[PDB]
Amino acid sequence: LEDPSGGTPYIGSKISLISKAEIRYEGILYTIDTENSTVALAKVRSFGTEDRPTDRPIAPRDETFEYIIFRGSDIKDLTVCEPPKPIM
Numbered sequence: 001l002e003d004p005s006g007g008t009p010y011i012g013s014k015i016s017l018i019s020k021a022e023i024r025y026e027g028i029l030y031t032i033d034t035e036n037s038t039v040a041l042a043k044v045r046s047f048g049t050e051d052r053p054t055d056r057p058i059a060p061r062d063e064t065f066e067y068i069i070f071r072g073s074d075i076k077d078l079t080v081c082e083p084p085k086p087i088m
Contacts, residue, residue, distance in 0.1 A: 008084035015041070017070060018077045022052030027068070037072040044068050 011029045018024055027044025044065055049058040 002087075004084050004087065007087040010080070013080060013082040016079050016081065017041070017075055019070065020074050020076055021049070021054060023047075023049050024051070025068075030067070038069060039072075039075075040067065040069050042067050
């Protein structure tokens with residue numbers, strides 16, 4: 001007996017994360033560290049900052065980062081794109 005959400009692994013799925021700076025980052029779930037309330041995403045890129053006006057000007061960048069770490073404290077919201085499929 002197992003829960004439906006548990007049946008589907010979060011790692012390997014596409015996720016979108018919104019940070020405290022009102023910037024939207026997209027990447028793939030690489031590793032989850034529950035013990036330290038931290039998540040590591042690989043192959044991640046930032047869509048833009050101008051979409052959410054801030055007091056700190058940010059220059060445009062079209063480069064992708066291999067590895068970036070975010071902590072639950074700084075993160076504002078987390079949404080998954082791939083939903084879990086029925087299991088039996």
